[PDB]
Symmetry: C5
Subunit: 332 residues, 5 copies
Amino acid sequence: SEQLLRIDDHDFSMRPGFGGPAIPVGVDVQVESLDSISEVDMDFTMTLYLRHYWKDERLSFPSTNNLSMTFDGRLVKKIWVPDMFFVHSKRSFIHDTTTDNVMLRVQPDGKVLYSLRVTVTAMCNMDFSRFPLDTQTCSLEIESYAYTEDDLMLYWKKGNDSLKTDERISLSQFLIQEFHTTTKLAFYSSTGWYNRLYINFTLRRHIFFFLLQTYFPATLMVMLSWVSFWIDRRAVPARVPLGITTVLTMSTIITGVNASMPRVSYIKAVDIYLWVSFVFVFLSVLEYAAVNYLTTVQERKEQDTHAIDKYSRIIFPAAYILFNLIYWSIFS
Amino acid sequence: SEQLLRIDDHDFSMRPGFGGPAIPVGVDVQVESLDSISEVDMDFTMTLYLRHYWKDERLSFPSTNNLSMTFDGRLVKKIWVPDMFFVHSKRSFIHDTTTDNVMLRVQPDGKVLYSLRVTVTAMCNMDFSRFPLDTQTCSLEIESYAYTEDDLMLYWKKGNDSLKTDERISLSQFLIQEFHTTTKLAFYSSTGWYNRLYINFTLRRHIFFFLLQTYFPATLMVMLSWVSFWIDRRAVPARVPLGITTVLTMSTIITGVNASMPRVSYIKAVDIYLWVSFVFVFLSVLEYAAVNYLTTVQERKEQDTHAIDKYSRIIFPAAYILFNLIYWSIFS
Amino acid sequence: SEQLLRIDDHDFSMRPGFGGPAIPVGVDVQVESLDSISEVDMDFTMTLYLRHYWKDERLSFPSTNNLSMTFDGRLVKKIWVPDMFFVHSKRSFIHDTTTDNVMLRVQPDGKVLYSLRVTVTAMCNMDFSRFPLDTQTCSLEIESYAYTEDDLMLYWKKGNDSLKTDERISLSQFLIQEFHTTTKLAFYSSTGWYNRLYINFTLRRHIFFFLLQTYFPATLMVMLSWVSFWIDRRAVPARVPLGITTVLTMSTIITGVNASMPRVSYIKAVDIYLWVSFVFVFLSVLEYAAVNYLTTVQERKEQDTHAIDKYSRIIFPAAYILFNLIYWSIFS
Amino acid sequence: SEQLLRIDDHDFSMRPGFGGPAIPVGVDVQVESLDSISEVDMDFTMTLYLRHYWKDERLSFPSTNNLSMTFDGRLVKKIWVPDMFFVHSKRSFIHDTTTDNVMLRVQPDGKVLYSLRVTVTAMCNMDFSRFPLDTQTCSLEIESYAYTEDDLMLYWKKGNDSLKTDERISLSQFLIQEFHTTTKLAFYSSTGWYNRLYINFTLRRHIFFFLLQTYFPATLMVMLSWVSFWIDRRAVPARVPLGITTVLTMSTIITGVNASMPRVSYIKAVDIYLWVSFVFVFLSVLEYAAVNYLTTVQERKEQDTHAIDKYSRIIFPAAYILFNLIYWSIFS
Amino acid sequence: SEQLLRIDDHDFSMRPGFGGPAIPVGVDVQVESLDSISEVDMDFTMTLYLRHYWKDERLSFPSTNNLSMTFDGRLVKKIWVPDMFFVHSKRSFIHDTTTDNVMLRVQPDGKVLYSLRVTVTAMCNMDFSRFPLDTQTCSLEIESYAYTEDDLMLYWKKGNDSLKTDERISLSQFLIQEFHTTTKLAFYSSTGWYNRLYINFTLRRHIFFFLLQTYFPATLMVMLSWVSFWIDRRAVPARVPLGITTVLTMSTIITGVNASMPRVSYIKAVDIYLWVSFVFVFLSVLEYAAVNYLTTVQERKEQDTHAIDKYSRIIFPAAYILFNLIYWSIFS
Ligand SMILES: CCCCCCCC
Ligand SMILES: CCCCCCCC
Ligand SMILES: CCCCCCCC
Ligand SMILES: CCCCCCCC
Ligand SMILES: CCCCCCCC
Ligand SMILES: CCCCCCCC
Ligand SMILES: CCCCCCCC
Ligand SMILES: CCCCCCCC
Ligand SMILES: CCCCCCCC
Ligand SMILES: CCCCCCCC
Ligand SMILES: CCCCCCCC
Ligand SMILES: CCCCCCCC
Ligand SMILES: CCCCCCCC
Ligand SMILES: CCCCCCCC
Ligand SMILES: CCCCCCCC
Ligand SMILES: CCCCCCCC
Ligand SMILES: CCCCCCCC
Ligand SMILES: CCCCCCCC
Ligand SMILES: CCCCCCCC
Ligand SMILES: CCCCCCCC
Ligand SMILES: NC[C@@H](O)CC(=O)O
Ligand SMILES: NC[C@@H](O)CC(=O)O
Ligand SMILES: NC[C@@H](O)CC(=O)O
Ligand SMILES: NC[C@@H](O)CC(=O)O
Ligand SMILES: NC[C@@H](O)CC(=O)O
Ligand SMILES: CCCCCC
Ligand SMILES: CCCCCC
Ligand SMILES: CCCCCC
Ligand SMILES: CCCCCC
Ligand SMILES: CCCCCC
Ligand SMILES: CCCCCC
Ligand SMILES: [Cl-]
């Protein structure tokens, strides 16, 4: 094998066909798993198989079998091999247990297949201002490092059919949909033009979990705060603790929701809901102070429900309804 | 030794017997420990010994002893060795202190034994919708990377007896049961067919700890909320703070249970319990407002227990009982 | 190629032109992304491309094409290459998947271009005493390790135009502004003088998020504490729980704000706001004790609003206003 | 030196004396520090020096000095060296700054000394059911990887005197006592018999810190709940809030103790204490409801302390005392 | 250069002058930064430059220039170099981007200078029983690994002037003071005597931040608890909730201070303050129960301030004052 190929009779720092046109190289990918997601750092981790095809007649051998052979890794450092890399990546590695996950098959003609197994972490810019009703889209990019479109030609081996995805892929916090591929040509100011391949996909959440954990308790709190309009205004020590305890409860809920968020420092769509229900509960406590002050001054002036109570009984819910209509018209 | 074997007289990029049938290779495993589990990331970590057997007559030597020899590691890179790898793995390594944990024994015939010590992290899809009453099953998969069933034949060396497990294995959060092995043949669309080996096992939790930490306090809270049906309706400042303080207490408990969960964003079987006891406590606070409003309007109209109290005293517990029956009929 | 260049006919431990003047070396940078920031550890992480230019006539070759060639990495360890390093850095590495991200281009003259892809973590001293109204500025420094200004001359290749920045750069907690470059000469007491290059930039926060999360609820709490001046002093069991519950609420808010801060142990500008509103709420609770004690002793002496109430109704808000004026005059 | 020893005249893949009996190899250890402990993962980290002694007459040299020489590391890969490894370990490494921490001394006879500096993480099964009154014992195990008791003989160089421990060893959460060594022979089903060395030690906690942080406040809470037996039963709005506020306080304490525990999911000895004091506080709140209901029905029937109060004043503390006696008889 | 020095004509496994006396080697250090501190693990991280000087006439070359040359790294593995290491260290490394941060300068005589750039984590035993009023001192130790005082002599190159410290060094949680150096001779029982160098320094905190965050709110709580001595004893429903709410508030504060401490399990000087103010608040709640019981029994016996109130008004503060005097006499 090491003899079948005239390894010492050629020069492999030289791309196959240095001189005239660019070498065609064709790519095939199969995704094994998506491993983790960070919302704070804005990135994701994926593990896949990567395959390459090309022809190099320096590697042809005399056999009659019309069938391929096999090598692994050691030969990659003797021969010439392409040099793809992952664009917009934070870290990556190739697996090496119990030996290097690298495969090499060569036919009599010198046609070649070359394959690896890798894990990549790759950046994805996200926007959380519609949280928890956001949708995100991410991508993985592949490019040649050293050779430009005048020396190497990059393309998907079988067009739209060059991506395969494993059956058992899932996340404990997301739903994954819409895998597909595309291409684009890209330019560097000090080095030139290159071809680039993409893999795209889309993410969404489970909205009912967030509904019950956040929107439901605050609504029950705002509804608890309307009870005070139906209690006798003469019962001061039963109308005064109620409001302030309700404020305490709502502040506890809001604090509890703040101590578990992914810690991204700009205003999002649930913060608005929570702070508006805080303001409603606060107004309910101003109302009864108005009523008490007026009843007391009347008592002093002289020496039945109050108008403000029987008006609040109507006004407060209608305005909560009006707020909910507008809010869900804006975030749908 | 390096001379006993004609190392320079052979070609080891070539599998033993390249040409005709596939080489038989036989595997034996002993598990040392399970090291950690992640419920958020859905994976586990294990450490084991791995052993291989095969015959290669390029390694035979003239001795009369009918007994094996020993080598370590350096020789593995001179001779031909198989290339197994762990399927659906996130990371792994071989230990190297104070030197490489690799052993090699060869007999006069050329029969070989080869062994390593490794640690692997490996994915396991879990479903937590019955939490804390869930059960999970995981597995470790082993496969050849480079050679197909037409070049290498993979099997357990001794059938069901090829797995051994250490005596002192345990986790601080789980109970481990039912180790066993099996096999399956698997197919890749661009490379072909391979043999694969499995090791399976099962996990369970301690249910009484979760019972006391979560289900018990909420039940005592719902039972505390029924006390208010037996207090005099004329005692407004002693019936009004009770309910709202009880709501405060229950919200504190629920928040405390949310700040320690493994953070998996979909609805599970304990969330339902907690939110239904929240709704019961909320209804208890609506009840006394009904009673107060009615007594007040009667006082105004004119100028003994109330029916609603003596009806609630019966209705509320029966419905809590009915909820518990249905809930534990569904989750058993 | 390895032959075109007389590799074995020269000595590369020797800088080009050892002897007379210093070699000119010129630098070009393109920033890909800012990856993370730590406020506790005072540092940041960046990923970029780095490019070098120089001439070495040991690498010239006879060709007529007036056009460059290509190599990658392996050649870097055969020839002489500069040795820049990142000053005030905690950690860094060069990417190596699927092979080393290193490029090398040589023209017939022996002019050279050399480029890498790296990730660096680099220290930045920050001062948080104006938090959340702080502004920070950071920088990345580049220097030669081994050769002084008498052997190597470091400069930007194109002056102000030698820095390029990617379009899609962002952080989930900051706004980035004002990239520019400069230079400075620097001195080591036991080794001598060197040239150094800088890249500078500036950071700011989103102030409205911090406003709503911190300053707003405490203000509503201080305003809730003024309600007690308008309730009848004869209603002791409705004036005594109010203050103490309000204290409870404010302490809960402050504790909630302390359990999420970046944990830097010196006094900052929001702590002052929070503790002054604590002191206001505390004084409101001392006030009514004064009023109760005086009314009781008058009752005992003998056997209408009180002056202190109708004075507090004016004094407390004016002093809160006066505090806000001074505070926002100091932090603007 | 490299010449003094006839390196190229011998074969070092071959253990000294391959053939007849087993080589004696003798071990000496000095512990520098214990570095960290994990209670969740059940393991510890230690750093030490390790020393070996043996004789190999392939390394003898003609000198008259009767005194040893020195080498470092590079020679270890030319000659034959033993292959010990740490049994039941999760990770380890050898230090390499500013070069490899390896020492080698050889005398004229061929006697050898060989020493390293390493850090190891090693598993320790712990049982926390007596927490905070638990005691744990851990150990570090040392074994040959490749050679059995028929090829290598492992023993402590000086018996009980072969372990030394540094003066300045401590942990910020434990007290360390009782270092000693021992040996045992161990068996592998597919490879055979080996010798193994042990180092053992013991751990304990500071019990008074846990006492004040956990047992003290709950006791004061249970004692606060007995005050309600001495207040007038006619004071409903002063007897009804007291109990429920006390329940709130105790639930806050318990939640605070749950949010800081090492997160091991089975019932331990402090959980029992806390939940029994919860049940006592709950019964105190049922008591006064009984008393109120009875007084009210008597008032209705007709139209002085109550017996239940003056009985509870005696019964509740005695039963708390009886619980404490039994509890501290069981956990001592 | 590689020729100027007769590399192949000498033996470098042999220290310069093997035989007679010990080689003098002299050390110079410059500290770049202190990077982080762990109070739980008791250690710190530092980054510095390290320099060595010695003479070796195997490296002399014929030149007339009386001036030094330069090499980098590759030569270190051809020639003989010392072998210093950091004593009591947990981890360390040498920086290697964009190449190895190693410098080598040789003069015609064979005098040598050798320098590196490293980061070290190093243990420091701390005692927190005076927290937050503690002071700590730490050190970094440097020693030869392989050679004893009979083969190598270690000393500071310029005495007290051999340490330089960067201008821009700081921590976000500490103040750093008092850098200085010293030396000591040290002994190993199985290997012998060595020289060791030290760098020492001192740390302190910001005490006013801890004062306002911890001591201030508890004091205001103890002062709030004295208000109850001035309210009318006839106002039961206004004297009974006050104490218990105050207890709730103080327990919340203490829990909040426990959920952010560096988690070191022994009693410290702030714990005492907090638990004594807890006991004061608890006694204030026992007091009014005494007063109520006595007034009630007098009412029953028959059918103005109470003595206990007008005595407590004096006794409680004086004892708080007396506690503060003693406490701050003990911790100063
Ligand atoms: C499935 C639970 C839905 C809760 C909706 C609450 C809207 C305020
Ligand atoms: C919001 C509570 C209103 C209760 C009205 C009851 C009328 C029967
Ligand atoms: C960007 C608008 C924020 C509005 C916040 C309102 C809070 C009551
Ligand atoms: C928000 C309710 C206002 C009610 C005003 C009533 C004036 C008589
Ligand atoms: C062993 C404790 C069991 C608690 C059961 C509580 C069910 C509500
Ligand atoms: C998927 C059904 C959720 C029901 C939640 C009910 C909460 C009261
Ligand atoms: C859930 C209790 C309802 C009671 C209704 C009583 C109507 C008289
Ligand atoms: C957009 C919200 C602003 C809130 C300002 C609060 C100032 C106390
Ligand atoms: C701070 C509340 C004052 C209420 C006054 C109402 C006068 C109509
Ligand atoms: C450095 C001045 C701090 C002032 C704190 C005041 C808290 C009421
Ligand atoms: C801070 C308010 C003081 C009011 C004093 C009134 C004296 C009659
Ligand atoms: C040193 C404090 C001891 C506290 C004991 C409390 C027992 C309930
Ligand atoms: C538990 C409090 C009892 C108080 C009794 C006081 C008798 C003088
Ligand atoms: C294993 C016995 C647990 C008992 C728990 C009792 C809680 C009140
Ligand atoms: C739920 C408390 C009921 C109390 C009834 C007592 C009858 C003696
Ligand atoms: C636990 C106290 C029970 C008291 C019963 C009294 C019956 C008259
Ligand atoms: C600068 C604030 C000092 C606070 C001192 C509090 C002492 C109890
Ligand atoms: C601790 C509050 C005492 C108030 C006394 C007021 C005397 C005018
Ligand atoms: C070591 C003495 C501890 C004293 C604790 C006192 C708590 C009230
Ligand atoms: C701690 C205050 C004690 C007061 C005792 C008064 C006895 C008449
Ligand atoms: N294809 C990536 C190259 O352009 C790298 C660089 O920017 O120099
Ligand atoms: N056995 C694994 C191989 O099929 C790898 C690949 O997918 O190319
Ligand atoms: N340019 C950095 C050199 O001065 C390194 C050192 O301080 O020795
Ligand atoms: N001494 C350890 C060996 O037995 C390794 C193995 O289990 O193969
Ligand atoms: N100078 C350190 C040496 O003594 C290492 C050892 O303890 O063997
Ligand atoms: C917040 C409600 C105020 C009503 C004044 C009449
Ligand atoms: C929630 C109970 C309402 C009862 C109305 C009669
Ligand atoms: C804190 C207010 C005190 C007023 C005394 C007249
Ligand atoms: C929980 C105490 C009940 C007493 C009934 C007489
Ligand atoms: C009044 C009796 C009290 C008994 C306490 C043990
Ligand atoms: C705790 C104070 C008790 C006073 C008894 C007279
Ligand atoms: Cl009342």
